[PDB]
Amino acid sequence: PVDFTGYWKMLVNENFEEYLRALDVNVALRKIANLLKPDKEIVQDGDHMIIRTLSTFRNYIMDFQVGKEFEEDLTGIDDRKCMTTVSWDGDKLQCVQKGEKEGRGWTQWIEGDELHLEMRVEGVVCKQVFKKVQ
Numbered sequence: 295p296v297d298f299t300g301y302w303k304m305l306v307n308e309n310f311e312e313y314l315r316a317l318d319v320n321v322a323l324r325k326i327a328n329l330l331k332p333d334k335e336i337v338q339d340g341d342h343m344i345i346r347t348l349s350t351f352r353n354y355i356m357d358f359q360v361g362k363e364f365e366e367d368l369t370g371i372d373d374r375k376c377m378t379t380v381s382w383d384g385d386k387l388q389c390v391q392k393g394e395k396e397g398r399g400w401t402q403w404i405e406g407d408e409l410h411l412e413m414r415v416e417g418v419v420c421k422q423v424f425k426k427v428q
């Protein structure tokens with residue numbers, strides 16, 4: 295497939311508040327989250343991927359094998375646990391996070407020189423777009 299490795303800076307973040315509200319994040323944390331601009335630092339070797347979502351407040355780290363289900367600990371976000379699987383769909387990554395909230399997951403892909411991420415939960419869609427600094 296494709297190599298997502300890079301330090302990607304956020305350009306776009308649409309509907310993040312609604313996405314966090316659907317995860318039951320409290321108003322205090324939503325307030326500070328509202329002014330963050332999380333970046334993505336990704337290192338990949340084939341199906342082995344580390345995706346670090348980096349902000350000045352808190353980071354969220356994923357470390358997984360594409361195609362292999364794992365127990366995802368969402369401490370720092372909503373502090374839930376999911377049965378999560380990230381899969382290749384051509385050159386896109388499709389993530390399903392099974393657990394309390396229905397329809398939770400995300401899709402990540404590169405379009406030209408932009409990293410696109412669509413995060414989903416209970417019918418809410420949050421759109422994020424990132425670019426490396428040339």
Ligand SMILES: CC1=C(/C=C/C(C)=C/C=C/C(C)=C/CO)C(C)(C)CCC1
Binds near residue numbers: 330352353371
């Ligand atoms: C609310 C909240 C945050 C949410 C991070 C999320 C929702 C990351 C999702 C990452 C994905 C889907 C990576 C695969 O690209 C972070 C922890 C930044 C700071 C503390 C507040």
